[PDB]
Amino acid sequence: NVYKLLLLGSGESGKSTIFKQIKLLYNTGFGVEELKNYTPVIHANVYQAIKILYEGCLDLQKKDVSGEYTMRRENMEHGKRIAEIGDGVDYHPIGLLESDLIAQIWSDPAIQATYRKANELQLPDCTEYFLSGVDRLAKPDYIPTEEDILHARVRTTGIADVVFKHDGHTYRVFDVGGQRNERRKWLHLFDGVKAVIFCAALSEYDQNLFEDEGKNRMVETMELFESVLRHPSFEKTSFLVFLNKYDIFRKKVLSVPLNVCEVFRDYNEVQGDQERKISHALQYIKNKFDEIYKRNTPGLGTQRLCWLFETTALDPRIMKYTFELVDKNLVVSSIS
Ligand SMILES: Nc1nc2c(ncn2[C@@H]2O[C@H](COP(=O)(O)OP(=O)(O)OP(O)(O)=S)[C@@H](O)[C@H]2O)c(=O)[nH]1
Ligand SMILES: [Mg+2]
């Protein structure tokens, strides 16, 4: 008797990172042979970040010849060759000469100005983590760490599942892609679900979708949440909402106000120290998700539960705490 969990949310909300985190905490885990199979993915992510930075820099220079966005002509050439390696079908791991050029691109001031506009780009979140550590990833004896695996970015396009045990209870969690094209595939997974883990990126409120750059990422997340809550298969199904990327949110909400996002235009920032500002904004986002849940659950908590958790999917301590909080909530609530 196996309780089925279903990871849902829009693209890059964090579902696969949570999926790996579950493998790390409740099973083994990785997996040195399978860790090495992530080297090509990590290299691909690096090549893709340089490509998007280099192309975005060139476009930002077209709009503005200040020129805050004009690269050193040397790094303009290096940026072109490195991006053409990524686009090639050949193979080409990142060796020492590659890492030296990538590092040199990443250090150009125009690239860092472009990187400060990552929200206007479609830049993988792991960009700064991997580019800063490009020399380590280029060594011939390099084995990815478990931290590397959690940062590595693979756009999910199939169904994956893993079973795990805690207490005497068996679980099977399913991972599926969240980009628009992959959502046809959700419908047949909707049966026999004991709980939906709905991932929602807190840090996305100043970004537009990869599938449609006219659509705010967070508006899409909230419409998507409402559309899942309104599906008949989930009428009496529990929702655990992971308000993920809390680490990124902490930095962003201090520098980009929430009102940049159309669903947060009524936000009124309080004054105080960094943590009262962070805390107040998070409570405000939580209330908004709560409102969507209440609007769509006539019998509220006697129909289905909806618990909200701020999370950082990369961080095992925060994840271990988050899952223990779930069990602590179930014990106090007398729910089985
Ligand atoms: N800083 C930070 N990065 C995160 C966090 N969660 C996920 N990421 C990073 O964001 C990237 C995208 O996350 P991912 O798990 O692949 O999203 P997804 O929901 O599975 O995306 P898709 O399969 O529907 S396209 C990954 O590279 C991951 O490392 C987080 O909480 N904080
Ligand atoms: Mg995924």
Residue numbers in the entry: 36 to 371
Which lines from the publication concern this structure?
In all organisms, the core G-protein complex consists of one subunit each of the α, β, and γ proteins and exists in bimodal active versus inactive states. Signaling is initiated when the bound GDP is exchanged for GTP on Gα, which results in conformational changes that dissociate the heterotrimeric complex into Gα·GTP and Gβγ. To avoid response saturation by active Gα proteins, faster deactivation is achieved with the help of GTPase activity accelerating proteins (GAP), such as the regulator of G-protein signaling (RGS), which binds to activated Gα to accelerate GTP-hydrolysis. The two domains of the Gα—the Ras-like domain and the helical domain (HD)—flank the guanine nucleotide binding site.
To gain a broader perspective on the regulation of Gα in plants, we performed a structure-function analysis of Gα proteins from a lycophyte Selaginalla moellendorffi (SmGPA), a member of the earliest diverging group of modern vascular plants, and a monocot Oryza sativa (rice, OsRGA1), which does not have an RGS gene in its genome. The Ras-like GTPase domain of SmGPA with the GTP analog consists of five α-helices (α1, α9-12) surrounding a six-stranded β-sheet (β1a-b1f) with the helical domain (α2-α7) connected by two linking segments. In the SmGPA·GTPγS complex structure, the guanine nucleotide analog is bound in a highly conserved active site to provide a view of the active GTPase located between the Ras-like GTPase and the helical domains. The guanine ring of GTPγS is bound through interactions with Asn279, Lys280, Asp282, Ala384, and Leu349, and the ribose hydroxyl groups hydrogen bond with the backbone carbonyl of His186. In the active GTPase configuration of SmGPA, the three dynamic "switch" regions (switch I - Ala187-Val198; switch II - Val208-Ala230; switch III - Asp241-Arg252) involved in GTP binding and hydrolysis encompass the terminal group of bound GTPγS. In addition to the amine group of Lys50, Asp210 and Gln214 in switch II orient the terminal phosphate. Asp210 does this through interaction with the Mg2+ ion and Gln214 through hydrogen bonding with the γ-phosphate. Hydrogen bonding between the side-chain hydroxyl group of Thr191 and the γ-phosphate locks the switch I loop to bring Arg188 into position for the hydrolysis reaction. Beyond the active site, residues in switch III interact with residues in the helical domain to bring the two halves of SmGPA together. In the active GTPγS-bound structure, the conformation of the three switch regions favors interaction with the RGS protein, which is also confirmed by ITC analysis of the SmGPA:SmRGS interaction.
